[PDB]
Amino acid sequence: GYGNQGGGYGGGYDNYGGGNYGSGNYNDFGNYNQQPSNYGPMKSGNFGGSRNMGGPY
Amino acid sequence: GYGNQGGGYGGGYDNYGGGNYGSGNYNDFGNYNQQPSNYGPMKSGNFGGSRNMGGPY
Amino acid sequence: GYGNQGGGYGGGYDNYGGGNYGSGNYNDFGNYNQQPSNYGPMKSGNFGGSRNMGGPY
Amino acid sequence: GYGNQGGGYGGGYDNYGGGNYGSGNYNDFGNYNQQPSNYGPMKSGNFGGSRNMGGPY
Amino acid sequence: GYGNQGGGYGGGYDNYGGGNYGSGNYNDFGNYNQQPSNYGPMKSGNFGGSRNMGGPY
């Protein structure tokens, strides 16, 4: 039984290439750029996992 | 039983390549750039795991 | 029984490549760059684990 | 019984490659860079483990 | 019984490669760099372990 009557199966997440993958924010400051900046804060939610908040049993 | 009536199965997370993977933020300051900066704080949520906050048993 | 009626199974997390993997933030200062800086604090949430905060038994 | 009615099973975390892995922050100062700096403090949450904060028994 | 009605099973954490692994912060000062610095303090949360803070028995 895979998470029946509940969270189930998160899935299959496979990365075979470079660059960013997931929930984290990605700042690529490029090529030959003159003074690039962000000034922006970054908050990235949770990655994967299994969480049960089910009601009374 | 895999997390039935509860959190279930987080899943399969496999990384076969470089670069960032997950929830952490990624700053790539590039190539031949003149004074690149961020000024942005970074907060990254949780990676994987199993959490139970279920009600009364 | 794998975390039935509770947290369940966190999952399978496998890293076969370089670069960052997880919840920590990644600063890559690049190639041939002129004075790259961050100025941004980094806080990274928890990695994996099993946590029970279930109600009364 | 693996963490049934509770925290469950944290999961499988396997690292077969270099680079960073986990919750610690990663500063890579790159290649041929002119005066790279961070100025950013780093705080990294917990890695793995099992924690019970369950209610009254 | 593995942490049933409680913390459960922390999991399997196996490192077969170099680089950083865990919750400690990683400063890699790179290759052929001109005066790289950090200026950033590093605080790293707990690694593994089992903790019980359960309510009244």
Numbering used by the authors:
A (entry chain C), B (entry chain B), C (entry chain A), D (entry chain E), E (entry chain D): 263 to 319
Question: What does the original paper state about this entry?
Answer:
The protein hnRNPA2 functions in RNA stabilization, splicing, trafficking, and translation. In its role in protecting mRNAs, it is a component of cytoplasmic stress granules, one of the so-called membraneless organelles (MLOs). The LCD is rich in Gly, Tyr, Phe, Asn, and Asp residues, and poor in hydrophobes, with Val, Ala, Leu, and Ile entirely absent.
To answer the question of why the mC-hnRNPA2-LCD hydrogel exhibits reversibility, we determined the cryoEM structure of mC-hnRNPA2-LCD fibrils to a resolution of 3.1 Å. Contrary to the globular proteins which form 3D structures, the mC-hnRNPA2-LCD structure is confined to 2D layers which stack on top of each other, forming a twisted in-register β-sheet that runs along the fibril axis. Out of 161 residues in the LCD, 57 residues from Gly263 to Tyr319 form a fibril core. The mC-hnRNPA2-LCD fibril encompasses a PY-nuclear localization signal (PY-NLS) and the core hexamer segment containing the site for a disease-causing mutation that was identified by Kim et al. in 20132. The solvation energy for mC-hnRNPA2-LCD fibril core (−19.5 kcal mol−1 per chain and −0.34 kcal mol−1 per residue) is comparable to another well-known reversible protein fibril, FUS (−12.2 kcal mol−1 per chain and −0.20 kcal mol−1 per residue). The multiple LARKS motifs introduce kinks into the backbone of the structure, disrupting stabilizing β-sheets into segments shorter than the six residues of most steric zippers, thus contributing to the reversibility of the hnRNPA2-LCD fibrils. The PYNLS signal forms a hydrophobic pocket between P298 and N300 that buries the terminal aromatic residue of the steric zipper F291 in the fibril core, yielding a significant amount of the stabilization energy.
